Amino acid sequence: MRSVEQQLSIVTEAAVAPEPVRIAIAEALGLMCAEEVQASRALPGFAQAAIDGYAVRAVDVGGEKSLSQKSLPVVGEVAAGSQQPLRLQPKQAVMVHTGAPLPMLADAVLPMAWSDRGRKRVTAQRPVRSGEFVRKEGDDIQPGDIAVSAGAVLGPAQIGLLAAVGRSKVLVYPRPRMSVISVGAELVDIDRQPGLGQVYDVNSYSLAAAGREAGADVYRYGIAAGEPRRIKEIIESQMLRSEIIVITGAVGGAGSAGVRQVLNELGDIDTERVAMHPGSVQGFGLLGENKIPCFLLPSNPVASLVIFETFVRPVVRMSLGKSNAARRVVRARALNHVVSVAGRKGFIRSRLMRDAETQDYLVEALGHLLAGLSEANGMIRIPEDVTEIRPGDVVDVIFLAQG
Template identity: 45%
Template sequence: APEGAGGAVRVHRPAEARAHVRARGSDVQAGDLALEAGTVLGPPQIGLLAAIGRGTVRVRPRPRVVVISTGSELVQPGEELGEGQIYDSNSFALAAAARDAGAIAYRVGAVTDDAETLRATIEDQLIRADLLVTTGGVSVGAYDVVKEALTADGQVDFRKLAMQPGKPQGFGTIGPEHIPLLALPGNPVSSYVSFELFVRPAIRALMGLDDLHRPRVRAVLAADKALTSPSGRRQFLRGTYDAESGTVTPVGGAGSHLIAALAHANALLVVPEEATSVEPGDELDVVLLG
């Protein structure tokens, strides 16, 4: 009956014992491990923490990654291209890759080929960086400013790795707080492959995750002809992986400038150092790119 009308409520069915009553501890009991250390906190996990009365928990913040591209020839997209200039694609791709890995990314586009300017730019960025990534200027040319700017204090080591693309690499720490720095090559494909292999695991480690690397699978090469690879170098070719058939098909060529091929790929084909060719139908390792 309406409230205040003085009526009565007649119940025709008895309420069974404990009907519509939640048992205490039926969700999480005292002494249970609610969430393991290293768990990424999404909406359900935050809801669970609130439900068990935890006002605060200790977490690792997202690492702040500063991406700096170098090269006097670089122009920002949207601006006019002059003679001998190209658009800066690396800083955009690597900043997006850092976000994809779970970081907060800051993009610093196209620092000119001058060691002092680069050094000053890096010093300015140290205040907001947990990890610094540079791209370009690490080979053995006249304008390898990253090398010039960073070898002076001796904390960054430059090497030639037995891989293709991505042979020239630099790694070390910078500044009074020893912020980790990874210096990647300047070719667009080289820089992205290097990011996936070296920078992404570093970001994931800073986040406290155990799962550092992209998943790898074995796949059968589906191609019209054999793939060739230089002896003594581990080659990473772009391809499309089909989980249903367990095959991988190469996309584009091996050139380190072929961004279009990379944009249409979802995997990297790994040709080992000792292999100089892979025949159609052969099995090889494949790195899945999300």
């Protein structure tokens, strides 16, 4: 038997970081950028009128006056989205709408309110200087500007930013891929009708969901059945596409020796118990030439969720390379009696609450499948030597935040 801490070190040290991938920018939401992204186009890609008015050469409308102290033909009209090139000649105007592309060789927009507003010939009534009322090409982003840095989490604004500079794909740190497998001759799928000797496969659904909640990219393989040669094939196929593997029913007695022997042919398998309750019976192994973490969990659904919460979820967070998401631990007054095993750390699924008057934290232990899987939002963490918890005791509660 080893301690929870020793087991936690073993599994976390073996975590595999997923290979970076180039993906459609819509599919990068929430993922960490694995590259520096520089703009390739200028934004805006062309000089545009900042207002409604007349594209001009400033010098033709008072722009060259020494600051310390006749009409122009309107040779076109341009709305936003226009695609035909224009070229200003000297002493000409082009009437422009907000966003319209500036004619070539213009350098200013004369505001409509600073003109006589003439349709074919326009008169300036106030001067404008070169550059005024133009959104210059590249005013928002220039080619080579850093749009997104490696290490940044890609949210909606960054996805918008990637689209603005014409990037449709980006290199990201993908979610770690986890495959969830159930073995056991007694298992049937939940669309079946179980007979004598048969049990619904609960664990593949609950643990695939726990892996999704933890941030993994989960494939629920479901039941793996057959002679061990066929089961070896299944596990090998999941090793090809996984950073983490979870197998329930592989540990806990002689019935799983055939599967365990297959696992020892695929890698190094350790089945020493952890000094914890529930979940002392578990295993851990590294499969293949890349040593994929493979968690061997028991058929017990409550013990399996506790093992997943304690050891698998940390590896998912590390594999992910984003935040640690380490669970908050609060101190609470125990509402009811709990017993615990001397020498094992206890993990009791519980109800954490706030006292309506004191504002103190209260915890009600819930420990039978219904009570174990009923709605729990915390776990009392009982130290190895404590054997008894009385109402009023102050205990550690692992807060199991929703989602």
